Design a protein around this ligand. Structure first.
Ligand code: MG
Ligand code: MG
Ligand code: MG
Ligand code: MG
Ligand code: MG
Ligand code: MG
Ligand code: MG
Ligand code: MG
Ligand code: MG
Ligand code: MG
Ligand code: MG
Ligand code: MG
Ligand code: MG
Ligand code: MG
Ligand code: MG
Ligand code: MG
Ligand code: MG
Ligand code: MG
Ligand code: MG
Ligand code: MG
Ligand code: MG
Ligand code: MG
Ligand code: MG
Ligand code: MG
Ligand code: MG
Ligand code: ZN
Lengths: 158, 50, 53, 118, 86, 203, 122
RNA sequence: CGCGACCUCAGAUCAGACGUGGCGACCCGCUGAAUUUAAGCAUAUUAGUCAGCGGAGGAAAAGAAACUAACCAGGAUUCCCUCAGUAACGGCGAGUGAACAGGGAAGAGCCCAGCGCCGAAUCCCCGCCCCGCGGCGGGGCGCGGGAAAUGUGGCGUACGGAAG
C-alpha cells in the first residue's frame, strides 16, 4: 500500500529468515583467535618468513584491472627452469609453485626470473646438522644475524 | 485381579513400600525443607495407572 | 530330482551354450587340442616349469 | 551311484567343536547368590513364633531368586538341621517368605533358641 | 448411553508396560510400544515433538557409563597405572 | 598388456561377441538371487581402474536393482496439494541406479566399505551392478599406507553420504560455470550461504 | 577389630576366604539381632561388617585379577576383561605403528627433498 | 565306477575379527508439503524450507580444473567484504536472483589403473626363540599353511615419463 512518492522496493524477507541469521558477535574473539594462532605458527617456524613462501609478479586478468600487478599463486615451471631452481626443491626451500600457470609473454617471465634470482641471492639457508655444513649452506656469520621478516616477503608494488 | 503376574505384583510391591509417610526424625535436620510426604497416594483417589 | 538352484543354473547355462548361436570368437575355444598332442606338449612343458619357492 | 528319493537333501557335513584360542572372560563369575546371601533373616511375628512352636517349622525371608531346593540346602548348611519340606510365597512387600518344615527328630524351638529368635 | 453408562464397560485394558521405555504404552494386540516402538530396533523418536525428545535424552537418567567416560576423558583415558604409594 | 585389449572389447558392445557375452551373463544373473557374493570380478580391468587390487580383503558383490523410474509412494491417486504436485506417474529419482545399488549393498554389509562400483549387464526390467567392498579391519588393508585411508572413521559408509563415483555424479558439483549452485561444500551449503543475513556488529 | 586393606594383601587365599566366612556369619547374627531388637551397638555394627565384607572381597578380586593379567602378560590373545577398555573408536583406531609406517614413494621423497631451514635477509 | 585338479556353491557353538543401537546444535544423501503472498486463484511465492528417512566427524562436505576468462591474462577447495539486490528468471505480476574479476582469512600438495621393465622382486596367517609389551609390534628360524599371473610390490601419472 504505497504512499505518495518514494522508491518501490523488493525486500528479500519473504522466506523465514530468523532461524538463519549469522550474527557477528564473535568478531573480536575470532580475531584474537586468529592472531594467537598466527603468533604460534610464526614462532614455530622460527627463522622462516611468517608470510610463508614467495609469490610471483602477476598481472590481473581483465580489462578493468590489467594495469595493476598483484601477488600471484606460485612461480611457474618455465621461470623455474630458467632460474635453475628445481621443481621439487623450490617449495622445500620456500618458493611457491603452481604448474598450472602458462607464460604467454616474455618480459613477465624475465621479471619473475630476476625476482627468483634476487630471492636466491637474499636467502640465508641453514645447514641441516649444525655440526657439519655442506656446500650449499650460508656462512656462520650471517647465520647469526638471520631473523624473520614480517609481512609478505619482498613486497610487490606496481 | 487375584491372578497377578510377577512383574505387576513386583510393581505394586514397590509402590506399597513408597506409600508410607515421612519419618519424623527428619524435620529436625538443618537444611530441611520437607513438611510431609507430598507424593502420597490414596487408593480411592488416584488409580496408579497400570 | 529337484536339484538345487545352483546346480540347475550351472547345467542349463551349458544347455544355453549349446542352444544359442555362439559367435566364432567364442566358438574357437571348444575346437580344442586333442589328447595325444596335448600330452606331448605337456611332457615338453614340464621341463621348463618356473621355480618352486 | 543311484538316488532313490527325488529330493536333493543337504549333505550332512562335519562341525568341529569350539577350540577357543583364549577364554572370553578370564575369571569365572563368583557365586553371588550363596548360602549366606540366600537367607536374610527369620521372622519374629506372633504368627511366626506360634508356627515354630507348634508346627515345628521355621519362618525365614529369602531373596526372590531362591528355590525350595536352594533354601533347604542353605538351612542344612547353615544350621546343620535336616529339612522335611519348604513352602515359599512372595509377600506384598516383595521378599520371598519361606517356611522350612524340619525333620521330626529336630525341634525348631531349640533351633530358634540356638540362633537367637525368641 | 453414549456417556456415563458406557463408561462402565471399560474393564479390559489395551496397553501395558513396555520393556525399553518403561511407560505404559506397550499395546497388547499390535504388540508394539506407543512411545518407543518396542519390536523395532530403533527408538521411536520424532522431531515434531521436542518435548517428547526432552523427556528422555542422554541427560535424563543415571548415565551410569557416560558420566564415568566424561571423568575419564578429563585425564585422557589412563589405564594400568595407579598413583605411586606412600 | 591385455587390459587395453579387453577394455576396447568392452567398448565395442554392439559387436555380437560382446552381445552374446552380456546376454548370457544377464540371463545367469537374472536367475541368481538379488544380493550374492561374486567371487571375482566379471570385469577385471574396470575393477582395477576403480581400485580393486586383487588381494586379500577386497570382495565384490553383484546386485540387482529393479529398473525403472519412481512413482510417488502415495495412496491411490491423491497427493493432497496444489496442481503442480499432483502427478505421480512420470516422476524420476535423483540418484542413479548405480548409486542405489552400491547403497543397498553397503547397507547389507555394515562391516565393509564401498570403494566404487561398475556395470555388468541389463535387461528391460533389471540392471546389474558389481560393487567393490573393502574389509577395513583386515591387515593386508590396514598395513598398506596408500589404502589405509579407507580404515578411518570419517569414511564410514561412503555410499550413503554419497561420496563414491555414482553418488558423486548426482550431487551436481564440480568446477565450472555449470555448477554455480553448489559452490561451498554442496548444494545445501550453497543455499545456506546465500539465504542468510550477515548481520554485522557495526552494520 | 578394625580390619583394613593393607593387612590383607600378603594374606594367602584360604585364610582370606575363612575371614570372609566369619564376617558373613557375623553379619547374619547381627541381622537376627536387628529383627529381634538388639542394641544400638549392634545396629551400628552391621555397617562395619558390611564394609568389612566389602574390602575383603575387594582384596580377593584385586589379587585374582592381577595374577590373571601377569599370567596373560606375554601372550597375544588375552581376554576381553584384560584388554584395554578405552572408548570404542579409540580401540578401533589405527595403532601407533600403522599410522607411522610410510610408503616407499613418500619416504624417498622425504629423503631427497626435506624441508630446509631458511631465513630471508631484509 | 573310482581317484585327482580347478570352477561355482553350501555348512559349521570352526580360528581371529568386524557392523548393529544412542545423541543429532553444526555436517552429508534422499524425500518433501501446505497455511502464506499474488488484495481472488490454478503458474509462480512460501520452498529444496517444516515434517519424514538414512549416515558420519570433532568438524563434515569440498579440493588440486574436461576451470575462470578473451585480458599485457589469472590458477585447488573453503570463509569474509564487494561484485548486487546487478546480469537473469517471473500470469515479466507479486516476487525471485547468482557468477566472474578485485581486496582479504588461510595456504600443501599428491596417488593409482593403463603404457611398460624387473626370475611375484609382494601380502596374510600359524609354530619356536630373543626384546618390548594398557595402541600386540621389531628381529631370526621354519622341505609351515595360504593369497596372488583372472596381476601383488618397486619405478612411474599429464607439471610428462622410462631406458641407454
Ligand atoms: Mg496512509
Ligand atoms: Mg472409583
Ligand atoms: Mg483390542
Ligand atoms: Mg530413528
Ligand atoms: Mg502452483
Ligand atoms: Mg573427499
Ligand atoms: Mg552425467
Ligand atoms: Mg606406486
Ligand atoms: Mg568362532
Ligand atoms: Mg548409527
Ligand atoms: Mg491469496
Ligand atoms: Mg487477503
Ligand atoms: Mg482464498
Ligand atoms: Mg521452489
Ligand atoms: Mg527458490
Ligand atoms: Mg527436516
Ligand atoms: Mg563421536
Ligand atoms: Mg574430509
Ligand atoms: Mg589434474
Ligand atoms: Mg576460484
Ligand atoms: Mg549498489
Ligand atoms: Mg500480466
Ligand atoms: Mg574470485
Ligand atoms: Mg595475509
Ligand atoms: Mg603394476
Ligand atoms: Zn516402550
Amino acid at each position: 500500500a504505497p504512499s505518495r512518492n518514494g522508491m518501490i522496493l523488493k525486500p528479500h524477507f519473504h522466506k523465514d529468515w530468523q532461524r538463519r541469521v549469522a550474527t557477528w558477535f564473535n568478531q573480536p574473539a575470532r580475531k584474537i583467535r586468529r592472531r594467537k594462532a598466527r603468533q604460534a605458527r610464526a614462532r614455530r617456524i622460527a627463522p622462516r618468513p611468517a608470510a610463508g613462501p614467495i609469490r610471483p609478479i602477476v598481472r590481473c586478468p581483465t580489462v578493468r584491472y590489467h594495469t595493476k600487478v598483484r601477488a600471484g599463486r606460485g612461480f611457474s615451471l618455465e621461470e623455474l627452469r630458467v632460474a635453475g631452481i628445481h621443481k621439487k626443491v623450490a617449495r622445500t626451500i620456500g618458493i611457491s609453485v603452481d604448474p598450472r600457470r602458462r607464460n604467454k609473454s616474455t618480459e613477465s617471465l624475465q621479471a619473475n626470473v630476476q625476482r627468483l634470482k634476487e630471492y636466491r641471492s637474499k636467502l640465508v639457508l641453514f645447514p641441516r646438522k649444525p655440526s657439519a655444513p655442506k656446500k650449499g649452506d650460508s656462512s656462520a656469520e650471517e647465520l647469526k644475524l638471520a631473523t624473520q621478516l614480517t609481512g609478505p616477503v619482498m613486497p610487490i608494488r606496481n | 485381579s487375584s491372578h497377578k503376574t510377577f512383574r505387576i505384583k513386583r510393581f505394586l510391591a514397590k509402590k506399597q513400600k513408597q506409600n508410607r509417610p515421612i519419618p519424623q526424625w527428619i524435620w529436625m535436620k538443618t537444611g530441611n525443607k520437607i513438611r510431609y510426604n507430598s507424593k502420597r497416594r490414596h487408593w480411592r483417589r488416584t488409580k496408579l495407572g497400570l | 530330482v529337484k536339484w538345487p538352484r545352483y546346480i540347475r543354473l550351472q547345467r542349463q547355462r551349458a544347455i544355453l551354450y549349446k542352444r544359442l548361436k555362439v559367435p566364432p570368437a567364442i566358438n574357437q575355444f571348444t575346437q580344442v587340442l586333442d589328447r595325444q598332442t596335448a600330452t606331448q606338449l605337456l611332457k615338453l612343458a614340464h621341463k621348463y616349469r618356473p621355480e618352486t619357492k | 551311484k543311484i538316488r532313490t528319493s527325488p529330493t536333493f537333501r543337504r549333505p550332512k557335513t562335519l562341525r568341529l567343536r569350539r577350540q577357543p584360542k583364549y577364554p572370553r572372560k578370564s575369571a569365572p563369575r563368583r557365586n553371588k547368590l550363596d548360602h549366606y546371601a540366600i537367607i536374610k533373616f527369620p521372622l519374629t511375628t506372633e504368627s511366626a513364633m506360634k508356627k515354630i512352636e507348634d508346627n515345628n517349622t521355621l519362618v525365614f525371608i529369602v531373596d526372590v531368586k531362591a528355590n525350595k531346593h536352594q533354601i533347604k540346602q542353605a538351612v542344612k548348611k547353615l544350621y546343620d538341621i535336616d529339612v522335611a519340606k519348604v513352602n515359599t510365597l512372595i509377600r506384598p512387600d516383595g521378599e520371598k517368605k519361606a517356611y522350612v518344615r524340619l525333620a521330626p527328630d529336630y525341634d525348631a524351638l531349640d533351633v530358634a533358641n540356638k540362633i537367637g529368635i525368641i | 448411553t453414549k456417556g456415563t453408562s458406557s463408561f462402565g464397560k471399560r474393564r479390559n485394558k489395551t496397553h501395558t508396560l513396555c520393556r525399553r521405555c518403561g511407560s505404559k504404552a506397550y499395546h497388547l494386540q499390535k504388540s508394539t510400544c506407543g512411545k518407543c516402538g518396542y519390536p523395532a530396533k530403533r527408538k521411536r523418536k520424532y522431531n515434531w515433538s521436542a518435548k517428547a525428545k526432552r523427556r528422555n535424552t542422554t541427560g535424563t537418567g543415571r548415565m551410569r557409563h557416560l558420566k564415568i567416560v566424561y571423568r575419564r576423558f578429563r585425564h585422557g583415558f589412563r589405564e594400568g597405572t595407579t598413583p605411586k604409594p606412600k | 598388456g591385455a587390459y587395453k585389449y579387453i577394455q576396447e572389447l568392452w567398448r565395442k558392445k554392439q559387436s555380437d561377441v560382446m552381445r552374446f557375452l552380456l546376454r548370457v551373463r544377464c540371463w545367469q544373473y537374472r536367475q541368481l538371487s538379488a544380493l550374492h557374493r561374486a567371487p571375482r570380478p566379471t570385469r577385471p580391468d574396470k575393477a582395477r581402474r576403480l581400485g580393486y587390487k586383487a588381494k586379500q580383503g577386497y570382495v565384490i558383490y553383484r546386485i540387482r536393482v529393479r529398473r525403472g523410474g519412481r512413482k510417488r509412494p502415495v495412496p491411490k491417486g491423491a497427493t493432497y496439494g496444489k496442481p503442480v504436485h499432483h502427478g505421480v506417474n512420470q516422476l524420476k529419482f535423483a540418484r542413479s541406479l548405480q548409486s542405489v545399488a552400491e547403497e543397498r549393498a553397503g547397507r547389507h554389509c555394515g562391516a565393509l566399505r564401498v570403494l566404487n562400483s561398475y556395470w555388468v549387464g541389463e535387461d528391460s526390467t533389471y540392471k546389474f551392478f558389481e560393487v567393490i567392498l573393502i574389509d577395513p579391519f583386515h591387515k593386508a588393508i590396514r598395513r598398506n599406507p596408500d589404502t589405509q585411508w579407507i580404515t578411518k572413521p570419517v569414511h564410514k559408509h561412503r555410499e550413503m553420504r554419497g561420496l563414491t563415483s555414482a553418488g558423486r555424479k548426482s550431487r551436481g558439483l564440480g568446477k565450472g560455470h555449470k555448477f554455480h549452485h553448489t559452490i561451498g561444500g554442496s548444494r545445501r551449503a550453497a543455499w545456506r550461504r546465500r539465504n542468510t543475513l550477515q548481520l554485522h556488529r557495526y552494520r | 577389630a578394625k580390619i583394613k586393606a593393607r593387612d590383607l594383601r600378603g594374606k594367602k587365599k584360604e585364610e582370606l576366604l575363612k575371614q570372609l566366612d566369619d564376617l558373613k556369619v557375623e553379619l547374619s547374627q547381627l541381622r537376627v539381632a536387628k529383627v529381634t531388637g538388639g542394641a544400638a551397638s549392634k545396629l551400628s555394627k552391621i555397617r562395619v561388617v558390611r564394609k568389612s565384607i566389602a574390602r575383603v572381597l575387594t582384596v580377593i578380586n584385586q589379587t585374582q585379577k592381577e595374577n590373571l593379567r601377569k599370567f596373560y602378560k606375554g601372550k597375544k590373545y588375552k581376554p576381553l576383561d584384560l584388554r584395554p577398555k578405552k572408548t570404542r573408536a579409540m580401540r578401533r583406531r589405527l595403532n601407533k605403528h600403522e599410522e607411522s609406517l610410510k610408503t616407499k614413494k613418500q619416504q624417498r621423497k622425504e629423503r631427497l627433498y626435506p624441508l630446509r631451514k631458511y631465513a630471508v635477509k631484509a
